[PDB]
Amino acid sequence: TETTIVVHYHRYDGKYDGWNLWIWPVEPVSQEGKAYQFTGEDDFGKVAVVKLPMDLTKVGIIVRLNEWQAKDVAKDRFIEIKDGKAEVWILQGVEEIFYEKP
Amino acid sequence: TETTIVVHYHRYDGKYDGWNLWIWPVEPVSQEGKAYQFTGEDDFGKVAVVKLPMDLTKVGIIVRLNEWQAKDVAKDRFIEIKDGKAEVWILQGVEEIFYEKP
Numbered sequence A, B: 001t002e003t004t005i006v007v008h009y010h011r012y013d014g015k016y017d018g019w020n021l022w023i024w025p026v027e028p029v030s031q032e033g034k035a036y037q038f039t040g041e042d043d044f045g046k047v048a049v050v051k052l053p054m055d056l057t058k059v060g061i062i063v064r065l066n067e068w069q070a071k072d073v074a075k076d077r078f079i080e081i082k083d084g085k086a087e088v089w090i091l092q093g094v095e096e097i098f099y100e101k102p
Helices: none
Strands: A004-011 A019-029 A034-036 A046-053 A058-065 A077-080 A087-090 B003-010 B019-027 B034-036 B046-052 B058-065 B077-080 B085-091
Touching: A004 A019, A004 A058, A019 A046, A077 A087, B003 B019, B003 B058, B019 B046, B077 B085
Parallel strands: A004 A087, B003 B085
Antiparallel strands: A004 A046, A019 A034, A019 A058, A058 A077, B003 B046, B019 B034, B019 B058, B058 B077
């Protein structure tokens, strides 16, 4: 299977311009990261559907502003993948990554 | 002026295979990072001479193993540049970045 991560992101300030995800494979292989743009919105906020052409069990993610102008939570965080799928919700300034809608 | 950073790195375990620097412009502009390989050694350890074709006052640096397999100190660290030059010394597991030989 390939991997599909749906990421929901909400900013309390409502100012999303330039915010994007950096995501990199962590397991079973650690690889370079790439930037992914939000392509949609729902009632929670912005939505990105990230597809990687490999079977992963874990990725890293950092929400950054432009090319590392800033980060929304500075430390590396991770997303667990089961059956080539994951879906998470992320809130501005909140370290915890949620696997259901808050 | 362009920017020249000389980085000295020492590992107490002596096992340098796969260790490289990730470095990205931070000031006056934040840009994507790149990986740089050590090209030499001295009595302290490995040596990299990193040239960027722009005038920078600050860069980020992370010492990583392969493609983010691991980091030697996980958090973002930074190097201050004066007159397009800097030279630092970095020790395995030690957060502080030194601007003279320890």
